Design a protein around this nucleic acid. Sequence first.
DNA 1: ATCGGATGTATATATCTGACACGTGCCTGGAGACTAGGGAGTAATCCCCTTGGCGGTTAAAACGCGGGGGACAGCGCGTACGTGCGTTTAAGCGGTGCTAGAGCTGTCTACGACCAATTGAGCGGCCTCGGCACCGGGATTCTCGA
DNA 2: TCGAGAATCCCGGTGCCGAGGCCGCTCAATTGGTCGTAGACAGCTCTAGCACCGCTTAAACGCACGTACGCGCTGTCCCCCGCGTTTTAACCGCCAAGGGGATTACTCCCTAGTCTCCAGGCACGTGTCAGATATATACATCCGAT
Lengths: 313, 97, 95, 106, 105, 79, 82, 303, 75, 96, 95
Amino acid sequence: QNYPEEADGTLDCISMALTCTFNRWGTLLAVGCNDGRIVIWDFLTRGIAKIISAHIHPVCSLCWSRDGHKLVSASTDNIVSQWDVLSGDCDQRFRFPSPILKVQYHPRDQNKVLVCPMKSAPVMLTLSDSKHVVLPVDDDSDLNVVASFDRRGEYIYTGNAKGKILVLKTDSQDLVASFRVTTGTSNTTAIKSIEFARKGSCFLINTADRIIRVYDGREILTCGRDGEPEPMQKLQDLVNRTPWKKCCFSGDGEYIVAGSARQHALYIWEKSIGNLVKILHGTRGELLLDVAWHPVRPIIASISSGVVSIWAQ
Amino acid sequence: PHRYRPGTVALREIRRYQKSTELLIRKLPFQRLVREIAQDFKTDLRFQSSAVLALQEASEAYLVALFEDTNLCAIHAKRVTILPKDIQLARRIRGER
Amino acid sequence: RYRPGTVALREIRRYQKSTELLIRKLPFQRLVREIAQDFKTDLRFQSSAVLALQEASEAYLVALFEDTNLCAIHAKRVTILPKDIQLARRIRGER
Amino acid sequence: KTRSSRAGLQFPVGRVHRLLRKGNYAERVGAGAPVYLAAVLEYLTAEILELAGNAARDNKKTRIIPRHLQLAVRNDEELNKLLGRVTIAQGGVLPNIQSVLLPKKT
Amino acid sequence: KAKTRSSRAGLQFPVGRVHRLLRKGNYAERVGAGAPVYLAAVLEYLTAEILELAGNAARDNKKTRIIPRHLQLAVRNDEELNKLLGRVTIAQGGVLPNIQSVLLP
Amino acid sequence: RDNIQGITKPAIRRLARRGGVKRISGLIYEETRGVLKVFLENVIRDAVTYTEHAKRKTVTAMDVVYALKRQGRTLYGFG
Amino acid sequence: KVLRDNIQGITKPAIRRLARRGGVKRISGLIYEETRGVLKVFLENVIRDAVTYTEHAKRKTVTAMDVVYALKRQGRTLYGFG
Amino acid sequence: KPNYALKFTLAGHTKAVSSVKFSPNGEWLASSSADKLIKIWGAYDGKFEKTISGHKLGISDVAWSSDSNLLVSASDDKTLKIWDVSSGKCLKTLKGHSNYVFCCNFNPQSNLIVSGSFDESVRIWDVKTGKCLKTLPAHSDPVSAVHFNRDGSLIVSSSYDGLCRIWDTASGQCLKTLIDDDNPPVSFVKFSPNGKYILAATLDNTLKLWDYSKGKCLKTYTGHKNEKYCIFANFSVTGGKWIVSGSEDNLVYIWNLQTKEIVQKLQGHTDVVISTACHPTENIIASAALENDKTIKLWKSDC
Amino acid sequence: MQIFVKTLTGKTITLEVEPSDTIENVKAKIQDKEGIPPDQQRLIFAGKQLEDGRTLSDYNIQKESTLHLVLRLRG
Amino acid sequence: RRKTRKESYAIYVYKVLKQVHPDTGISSKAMSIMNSFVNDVFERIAGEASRLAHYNKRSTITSREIQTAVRLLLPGELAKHAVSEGTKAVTCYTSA
Amino acid sequence: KTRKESYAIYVYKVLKQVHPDTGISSKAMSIMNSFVNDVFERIAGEASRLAHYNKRSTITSREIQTAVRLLLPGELAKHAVSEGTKAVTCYTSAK
DNA sequence: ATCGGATGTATATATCTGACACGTGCCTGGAGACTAGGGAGTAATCCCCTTGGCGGTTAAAACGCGGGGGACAGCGCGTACGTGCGTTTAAGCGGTGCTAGAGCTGTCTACGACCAATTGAGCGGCCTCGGCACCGGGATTCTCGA
DNA sequence: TCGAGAATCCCGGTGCCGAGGCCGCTCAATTGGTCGTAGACAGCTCTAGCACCGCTTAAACGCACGTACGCGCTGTCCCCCGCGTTTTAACCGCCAAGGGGATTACTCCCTAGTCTCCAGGCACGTGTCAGATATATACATCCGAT
């Protein structure tokens, strides 16, 4: 139904907690502790699943496979291991030249994992033969490009650190779609991150000019090689000018969230009508790390500084 | 010395403190008190060594005044002591219920 | 009729319901002009100001009485005496 | 062109902007201060009128007499803390009788 | 260029300074050459009075150094200053001695 | 001039009933009238000076509200 | 961290001496706790206003002028600190 | 069509396997019998975990929490105990009942417990210690079933009397008392996911479910036998839209929510099916019967 | 003749535009048809700027094409 | 003599009352009391904002200063509701 | 290092004018700086509001005189207004 | 009531050492000089009600008598506070390094004042109609002395 | 435990002056450039509130006991409330005027704003001394002796 109106306590099965993500409809919670361990908590039941001793240097990003049989994590020590969900051991091990930002799995192709290396083109690794393919990019090859799938993962969208966004094929690698962002009035601006959804091919773009924007995953190919940018909603805050670090999308395909870092001003809007609807009264003092709704039921659960603040119904 | 009758040295103590000028509350306990009580409003605040002093000064002054008012109420009840009801009465009549 | 204490509560409840002013205007105005004459006389006033004054004063008085009542209850009695008014005005901070 | 309908308020925004400009509160006023202040005034006045109308409903009077305003303000606690050193003309007092001073018999 | 305005009337405390501090005070639109001057006048007058009573209590107590206690006692004991400074506090001062009659044995 | 006693005794009886008290000593009326004198004088001083600085020898009606507001009170319902 | 301690830091002789300067001889033994309470509730408002003033000014330190500003806003002024 | 085919036939107890419940987390099966034994069996492989013991006589009802950590068993030795699923040792005591314990369940919030005996009341205990907290009068007859709602705010009380009752957890007083003129005895109730419908397993060959929104009699679920024994019921929304229940004709049956159609008749049990359980994350059904079966059937399916 | 308008959620709507019909008439027809305010919508053709105060005859968009109806905020 | 014009918050609070309760009226003395209430609150908040701007060495009245004023002035949850309404109004106004 | 505003010498001079024997510590000129700056803020705000009250474009002497008559009680008002009129005459005579 | 002894109060003596005042460099506001332009006030005027005064009269108070409930003085009792002291326990210096923190300035890009002129929301004068003021009478609830 | 009398609330019954509407006539609220600027981002520069522990001791804890006083009870007596009455100025109804409250014209003059050299005041050293520290003594007071 509508936006959450009740608030609940904290879910700390273990003291340390960095990252959080739901699988498909909020089954299990994957937490990457800052000690080299990966913990699996049970959501909607208030329990735990398994604790995995990955390595010494801790992890900072985590995700699950398409079939749910693998636990991949963007390690800080460049340990690209496919930890088994069942046994908790290491199935396949490989080392990458650069650290990763976001790890994802194609919901139709588990073999090709998603990697976002630093200062290099995105790498797509086949787990059938441990073969890495460099995604073809444009302009500079040393920009912090972030790659992400579409709704179904059939296309891969990559964002450079200058203002160029490319769209290419998840398996064919036929670069045909490119885009140049608007340069405002006088100065160009880099783009921080892009976050996708599950219905409607919507995607939010967090940029460096302190304004969030929203677009659709069907405009880059239709315009041709390159066209004119056309934001749908230029959402921002004008009372504090809050910088944006993390931001997710809704589970029903109609709402949109923008998060704070230290001011605990969680803003929410809806795509149809771009007005403010609710603001979260969060206790100041912590830096927000991850936010994710149930892909079915409207909820917010922000993990930060080892604790989690949950607002639901 | 010996067990002496009450009320003789209380008057001298009143005379001593009512004339003197110093700070009746120890410094460091007030330091820790303000540090603890500023936790709720924002975490990891750092104080000026001259600010807190000011603060504590004002506080004690207020407290002293309250007691005087309380004393008056006690004299109105035809007794000498100070019972917790007098402070509540003084607070209510004062305007800060 | 008889039995003081019951008709007292009767009128107390009537008056806690009622909303009427109860003070006169001409001694009010002669005091006004004389206490101006203490400073400056023959000042050209208005006509609806008087009412205003009265309103405030009445509120003042009734509020004051409340505090005095408490003081009486503090001395384990019911009757209010000139002593309680002075106590209430002194501890209030208006001496 | 209208400016209060831009934000959905009902108190005027040009009037508040003019009144804030000519009152010499500062040398150079902003552009979001009038709308912010108009919204705050909206919320406060609607908050008062809600209980004012409810108390009028107690008396069934279509018009809301001042005693309803007095009852609404004094019965609540936050509005008590706000309008504490304040008197309301013609509004009367809120009923109260001391607990000890309750004459009773068999 | 000489002869600062504070000495234009035989006065001591700064008047160019107070003139400036009403200039940039953003209090009004035109700042005159007389109003902060009279502010400096009451400055000299009341400061002389107030350190006067300070030194008066000092010579009543034969201290070679003045503490704010003398000032607090002078303000507290007087009547019109007590009425004007009804809600006020003085740093590192105290209370004038007073004992209730009933309390005395 | 002498007109102080006009405020009658049952009037302050009614005000005491308003306040919430039932038993009143018979020697309470004099100091209530004294309090009324003090309050009235303080209010009317400020009222009259507020009118005097109009550069007009006259008096207005908002000046009572001005005096009440500056004294510490404040009145709603008159301009 | 929030712990029940450190409320009791201002000892009983301190309240004794403040009462003595207030001018009292006899004080019952159960006034200390509510004195703790009234001191705490007085401190809360002033510190809240001070931290608001320091938060609007974009620093995380309160000066000796924010405290006096807050006190003057409350109704009690300070002389001696700026 | 729900093609639930038997894959594992489990029979490890001695007296009668009359209580098997699939926990909402769907990890293990805590089979119970009237021989003071609690045997933990597997779910997708039927692996033998252990046999927790420690009571004195048989158990009437067994339940796991949402996280399947706490374990309540209706042992009739005037005591109830919680057994750790990891080890199988006594955690805390539930003293306070005066007679045989007939019913007991858990709270999805994992913070409250309800137990019932022949003292015409239902009691709750602190989960940390296990002391006496409240004794709410449920009915004038022994309570056959009691369970919390998914929202953790309401309780449904069913007994052999017939008038269903919904009790507030926040105050201990009943909200709605649905009264039936014929007053047919009830055996089991279960809360709906939205907490609006209840399924009163009535002892009149009819699973008369009730709506406490307005208090109106609804359609009649027939095609089975329910007259004497405490027959339970459960939901199934994984493969389709179905409700599973036992019957006194010695078979398990399944129906629809509001269509009144028989779609599957699980056979194999030789005696009256006293309890039914449906796996939460899989189309697996386990049904427990009376003394003449002593067997557990894992009916697995994919749609 | 008939063309398509695409919303953000992904649904496409087949609509009729006369060759001698201005854009404002089409916007009014859409507003009366589905209720979406014209101030919450605009015309975009292959990432190129289009306004409301013109005609499709001047722009000359080819047949059987789609127009990306970019959502706006009311007003 | 030569006529003058005066502004009061009459029609606006009438609209607010009609929107909240479309069955009740108002009196002239209630009208005056509501007008005086609005003027009092306006003066209080504007004065606090001006003094805050002067104290922080700023010459401009931004919208942050007014929100700090209503945080310092309004008590409890009333401040939260007021700041939420103000932020909603300014966010709705800016993008139009 | 940088420049800041404070009265240090003038207070010592005005202490020396009548009482040329006694010195003071930091707290003393602190409290007099506090008094001067706080009466400064209070007094300029009072003057400016009393100004905007009556629709003008400066700060004058007469508004200050009426405000002095409206805040201060009798004898302090007399002394202050007397010294102020002496200051006005002595400044206007020689500019 | 009267007198003596232990005990805390109040004052003079070496001295010293950290804090007060005196001396100094030279850099950023302030008054010396000067204009024009915009507020204001000062002489004049005209109409509204306050300023000032009179005929009716009345419900409310000024002034005198009746009586019982509460205020006020005294007396006993046992209880909690004051005065003392032995001792543990955490304040008071004191000293030390410093990392993570607060704070002064070059600058250029985004934001508000101003103005020309437009022109509809809003205020003021005139109906206007009923919500509500005023009034008559019967139904309804309460209290204490038999 | 029970009625006479006394208070209170409501149902019409009727008329009336205030809140609302409407027409008409403004006046200030925009729109768009224009322009000037101040306040925001990065840089380096200072540094101190704080972790860290060491040695010392005022003083807060805790126990002992002795007793002044808070509290409860009794009794006496006096004065506050209520009842009634006769008398009464404070408020109803009106009228007039005058003068000044509000409004206009206008000319004059006060200072915002600009250029400016100096001067005089704030940061940095360096000499000096007034009350703290501990000691020794005369004296006033609670408390106990008669």
